[PDB]
Design a binder for this molecule. Sequence first.
Ligand SMILES: COc1cc(-c2cncc(-c3ccc(N4CCNCC4)cc3)c2C)cc(OC)c1OC
Ligand SMILES: COc1cc(-c2cncc(-c3ccc(N4CCNCC4)cc3)c2C)cc(OC)c1OC
Ligand SMILES: COc1cc(-c2cncc(-c3ccc(N4CCNCC4)cc3)c2C)cc(OC)c1OC
Ligand SMILES: [N+]
Length: 288
Amino acid sequence: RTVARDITLLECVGKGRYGEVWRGSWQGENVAVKIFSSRDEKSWFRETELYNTVMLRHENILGFIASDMTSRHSSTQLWLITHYHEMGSLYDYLQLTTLDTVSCLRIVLSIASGLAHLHIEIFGTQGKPAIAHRDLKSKNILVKKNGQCCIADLGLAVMHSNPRVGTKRYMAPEVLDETIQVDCFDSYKRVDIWAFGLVLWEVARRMVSNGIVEDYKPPFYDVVPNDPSFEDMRKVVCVDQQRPNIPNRWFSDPTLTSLAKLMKECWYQNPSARLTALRIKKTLTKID
Ligand SMILES: COc1cc(-c2cncc(-c3ccc(N4CCNCC4)cc3)c2C)cc(OC)c1OC
Ligand SMILES: COc1cc(-c2cncc(-c3ccc(N4CCNCC4)cc3)c2C)cc(OC)c1OC
Ligand SMILES: COc1cc(-c2cncc(-c3ccc(N4CCNCC4)cc3)c2C)cc(OC)c1OC
Ligand SMILES: [N+]
């Protein structure tokens, strides 16, 4: 039989230190092709090892298609091929649109659903190890046409049944002050919950209430520079214990009032006090 492996690369939709992401076509279907830089080859190996261990399939997890290593003259080429989401990342989407109550809740519940799926160990033969993402942020969430999102980029993920770090802006206090209990898998889940709370804040700002909305801003936009240093973040999050500001106007809206409470419970200094992804999901299903 013929094994069709050609992928037509059509447009570059992202470029960074990690390499590039391309919209491509295989057998008439859109795919996304992440071409890894040499600097980020470990992310391809980690995501490939994870998917070789457990073939994750979930509506709120970016859908895997293939991992490819191709030998070249003096180098190795590494591609990750996934489903393609033409609306782009949540980071991109929130810059050009505001949200109503239903759309806001649908986004955040779908993220919580993908995150709880990663976090939970499932036993039996169609089960999965528990997984922590370790780089959750709005650029690593994609928006689907049906209004739900999916979580992307498991290049830093850890499974439970040289060392790298996530994006500094989204790092939890215990990462920045180096107290994280690196031998406890639950510690990594709690780092994800902190970052989820920041994403919740980014989304909520874009939900209209009483004719008011906030402009899109990244977490800590008002207290750290672009490309904040580790020390910049440590001073804000650990030393001064600052948290993203909740605007007054949210307290006139029942949804945003509830989401503010939820955020706060993701942002406790004590990691063990933070809500779990499953508890976040339940709370979200009862809002509105
Ligand atoms: C090797 O590389 C690539 C292969 C393919 C691909 C293309 N067509 C057919 C297949 C296929 C799938 C299953 C089976 N079997 C199933 C169990 N019983 C026997 C039959 C045979 C063939 C595959 C995998 C696509 C790629 O990209 C998108 C690839 O590159 C990453
Ligand atoms: C890698 O991605 C894609 C692969 C294929 C593809 C091509 N040829 C054969 C297969 C196949 C056929 C039979 C089995 N069997 C498994 C054991 N029990 C019996 C049944 C498995 C796999 C598949 C999935 C199609 C895609 O899209 C349409 C893909 O997505 C882009
Ligand atoms: C975050 O990680 C990954 C994302 C994707 C991915 C999947 N579907 C769509 C996109 C996309 C498409 C268009 C835009 N727009 C940006 C503004 N101007 C117009 C164009 C943004 C994003 C991307 C990036 C693929 C991955 O691997 C293969 C990823 O890595 C695991
Ligand atoms: N790592």
